[PDB]
Write a protein that binds this DNA or RNA. Structure first.
Ligand SMILES: [Mg+2]
Ligand SMILES: [Mg+2]
Ligand SMILES: [Mg+2]
Ligand SMILES: [Mg+2]
Ligand SMILES: [Mg+2]
Lengths: 188, 115, 135, 31, 76, 174
RNA sequence: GCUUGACGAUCAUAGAGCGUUGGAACCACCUGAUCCCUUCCCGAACUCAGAAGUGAAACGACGCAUCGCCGAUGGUAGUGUGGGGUCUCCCCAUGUGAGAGUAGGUCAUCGUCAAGC
RNA sequence: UCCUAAAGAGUAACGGAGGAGUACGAAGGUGCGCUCAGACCGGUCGGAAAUCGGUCGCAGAGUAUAAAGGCAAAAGCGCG
């Protein structure tokens, strides 16, 4: 996980569309805690390798603006709706001590053999994914493992069932709700 | 409370119509112990004359009677005429003009001040 | 077919079909989807020709969502009728599609059973629809 | 006001005015 | 069943914009029920029609609680 | 005089009893409302002036009549427009009317329990329905009509209804 | 500047919720209703005569961003004039540039006197 | 009165939707007072619902008469 950048001292609409067809570039910004926001050009080819990676969204990425180095986490992807490709990136500086909410993928690791599958009518319907995080950046949750190999038929899974290991909270439990996660039901 | 904001709801009609006419307002404030009176200039935020009971020549433990309030409105026209103030209005501030309110506003008409 | 139960009015203007689709272009429920890459409008009988194509190429399970709903009534004058004696009656109902909008979603199936199932539903729709995945 | 009518000759009389009109003046509870 | 029958368009609107100079009894706003309230030196007639009473320059300021629109005229 | 029974025995007792810090936290009775429901016989035009004269004697105070506020066609029309008769009792006629209850308005009921201890609102108010107008001094039996549906509703300065119980068990008749 | 009252200035970054805390000056509940006066019934409210008690309630201050409310930068939508194209829709040059969302903010700031330091 | 009507006025169609050809001597004036709907808990013959008490409200009620624009100095409600 490494990517290198440039400065982009040309703003607007007209100068921001000539980047995408002449040079194949993608705009970006770097805004953080203690500094100013700083715009940036990146290439469409180099973000394509990172966006193809699995856990690159919930992970720290280094950035070479010039020779300037910074540990950068990504929280946005504006994306072209019609054809489908990346537009400007809008990522974030990482301070060594700050609360830092982000989003984390799920896996549902062990559902080959379940009580609801092998005994009763076998269906497992994943409702939610991309559950958030609120954790210090010293420990990065790349993913959360959920196990539905023992949950029987007719039972659902809340957010209190799966856990958040080693100093990780859940924003939805900080509100007065507990969202359902996965169901096991009967096929038609 | 409950009583305090209901008489504030009763007071804002006449207090807002005296604002539009730009008249030197004579306000009042009754308590269960003693009675205030102020003359506020034509901007709502400037007090010209103000006589009370809590001054250091009148406190005697008998404030809270109708006879105590006659001297309050008596000794306030002498400070407004010393400030050169006539042509005033009388906001009763949600108080029913019957008892200690009305008796103070008769001492103003006696002491040369006129409405 | 799919149409509102009751309506606050009876007839509606024509309008236009402009812009792209910024909300509606993200897969939310399923893990595979058939999004539309050309603008048009769907006439609520094509939806049932495309629904009954996906719901017999699976026959085993999965779950189907229908993201789009027709609510715009359209008119049609009868024949041998001159123009200008009012406005014609409502014959059918129309949804309006613009590039990027997701039409159907599927989950709980294979990555290539579904790929050859949206081929059946795309041959009933008058639009050029592509194949996309959940991210 | 003055529109109301008291019967204070018996209202302000004795509650234990015998058990011959009140029918119970040594106990109030029948239970 | 058949439906033509519109009406004849009473010519409402706001006259005398934000920097004018007014006479004694000009018409400021032909209202339809108090989009604009009676500010400092204006009138508010029968059908809620703002009119002047003194001379000066129109302001169009937003004041106080409820965020209501007060049309005052300023001797400036 | 239950007021002189209140201040001397009940009022010092409850401050230590329910862990009350000062004087002014003690419960007491605010008012008594009755609300004789004449919702039966809407278009009667004969029973209201009877029902006023019924409640006129057992309280010693003139009632007021209560109109309606809708036309609930399933119940009745809005033509028989007065429906209710209500009396609010403040502090002078409170502790004197309260002595008729629980002393001589007990034996003429022919009941089992004088009042249930389960029916409360969440704040600490008690309500009760009395079936007959027979439980009353200075009343006729022959000239009275036995169509008198009467209620008793109590209001207390209680925060929650357990404090209503410790007040009600002092002058009790359950 | 600190204490309490009155009247304003400004209308939520000033709100709500939770917590905490104040007296014998102020204020509030309070005590009575004979005497003013009052209630489509009721001294509840209104009013009068007062200083047994209390700071409970109420009311101010003091804390908490949990709800609310404000809100960047960048990008994007749309659009004036001049030209384009495959022309029921878009694109180029140029001027203009939101809304939504993100980083984060917020437990207000003042003025006039009268009684306190 | 609303929409077509392009954020000043204006603006067509055998274009889409609705109303009027009146009431009122108080339904006018004025002074003085006072707040809605709805939910919910308790309460006798009513009960999904009548009258009463309570909390929650934060105009979702109301406006002689259509819809639009308004209404806490309430333009809404009561009294002399
Ligand atoms: Mg914005
Ligand atoms: Mg126009
Ligand atoms: Mg125009
Ligand atoms: Mg009217
Ligand atoms: Mg008024």
């Amino acid at each position: 996980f490494i990517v290198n950048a440039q400065v982009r001292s040309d703003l607007g609409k007209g100068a921001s569309r000539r980047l995408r067809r002449n040079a194949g570039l993608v705009p970006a910004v770097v805004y953080g805690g203690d500094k100013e926001p700083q715009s940036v050009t990146l290439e469409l080819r180099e973000i394509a390798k990172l966006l193809e990676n699995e856990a690159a969204f919930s992970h720290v990425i280094a950035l070479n603006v010039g020779g300037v180095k910074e540990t950068v986490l990504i929280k946005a992807l504006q994306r072209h709706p019609a054809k489908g490709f990346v537009m400007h990136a809008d990522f974030l500086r990482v301070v060594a001590d700050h609360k830092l909410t982000a989003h984390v993928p799920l896996h549902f690791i062990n559902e080959e053999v379940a009580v609801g599958v092998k005994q009763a009518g076998g269906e497992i319907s994943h409702t939610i994914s991309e559950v958030e995080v609120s954790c210090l950046p010293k420990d990065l949750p790349e993913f959360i493992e959920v196990d539905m190999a023992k949950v029987e038929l007719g039972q659902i899974v809340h957010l209190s069932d799966l856990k958040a290991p080693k100093g990780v909270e859940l924003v939805q439990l900080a509100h007065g709700n507990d969202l359902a996660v996965a169901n096991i039901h009967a096929s038609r | 409370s409950v009583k305090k904001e209901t008489r504030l709801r009763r007071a804002r009609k006449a207090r807002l119509k005296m604002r539009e006419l730009e008249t030197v307002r004579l306000c009042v404030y009754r308590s269960s112990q003693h009675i205030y009176a102020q003359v506020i200039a034509a901007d709502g935020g400037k007090v010209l004359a103000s006589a009370s009971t809590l001054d250091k020549d009148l406190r005697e433990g008998a404030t809270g009677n109708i006879d105590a309030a006659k001297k309050v409105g008596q000794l306030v026209a002498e400070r407004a005429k010393a400030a050169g103030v006539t042509q005033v209005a009388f906001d009763r501030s949600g108080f029913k003009y019957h008892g200690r309110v009305k008796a103070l506003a008769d001492a103003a008409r006696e002491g040369g001040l006129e409405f | 077919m799919l149409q509102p139960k009751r309506t606050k009015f009876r007839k509606q203007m024509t309008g236009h079909n402009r812009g792209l689709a910024h909300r509606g272009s993200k897969v939310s429920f399923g893990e595979y989807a058939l999004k539309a890459t050309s603008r048009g409008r769907l006439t609520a009988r094509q939806i049932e020709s495309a629904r009954r194509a996906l719901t017999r190429h699976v026959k085993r399970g999965g779950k189907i969502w229908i993201r789009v709903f027709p609510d715009k009534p359209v008119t049609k004058k009868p024949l041998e009728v001159r123009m200008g004696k009012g406005k014609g009656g409502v014959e059918y109902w129309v949804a309006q599609i613009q590039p990027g909008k997701v039409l159907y979603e599927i989950e709980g199936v294979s990555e290539e059973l579904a790929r050859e199932a949206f081929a059946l539903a795309a041959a009933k729709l008058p639009l050029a629809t592509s194949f996309v995945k959940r991210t | 006001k003055a529109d109301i009518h008291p019967t204070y000759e018996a209202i302000e009389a004795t509650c234990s005015c015998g058990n011959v009109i009140k029918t119970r003046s040594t106990l109030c509870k029948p239970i | 069943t058949r439906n033509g029958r519109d009406s004849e368009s009473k010519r409402l609107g706001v006259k005398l914009f934000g920097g004018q100079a007014v006479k004694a009894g000009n018409i400021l706003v032909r209202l339809r029920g108090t989009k604009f309230h009676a500010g400092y030196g204006v009138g508010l007639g029968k059908d809620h029609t703002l009119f002047a009473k003194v001379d000066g320059v129109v302001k169009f300021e937003t004041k106080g609680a409820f965020g209501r629109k007060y049309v005052s005229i300023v001797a400036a | 005089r239950l007021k002189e029974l209140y201040r001397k025995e009940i009022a010092p007792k409850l401050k230590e009893e329910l862990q009350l810090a000062n004087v002014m936290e003690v419960p007491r009775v605010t008012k008594i409302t009755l609300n004789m429901g004449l919702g039966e016989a809407v278009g009667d035009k004969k029973i209201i002036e009877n029902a006023v004269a019924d409640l006129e004697k057992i309280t010693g105070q003139k009632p007021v009549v209560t109109y309606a506020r809708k036309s609930i066609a399933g119940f009745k029309i809005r033509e028989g427009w007065p429906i209710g008769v209500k009396v609010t009792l403040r502090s002078d006629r409170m502790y004197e009317f309260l002595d008729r209850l629980l002393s001589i308005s007990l034996p003429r009921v022919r009941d089992f329990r004088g009042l249930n201890a389960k029916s409360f609102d969440g704040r600490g108010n008690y309500s009760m329905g009395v079936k007959e107008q027979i439980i009353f001094p200075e009343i006729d039996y022959d000239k009275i009509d036995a169509l008198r549906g009467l209620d008793i509703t109590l209001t207390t300065t209680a925060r929650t209804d357990d404090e209503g119980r410790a007040l009600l068990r002092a002058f009790k008749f359950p």
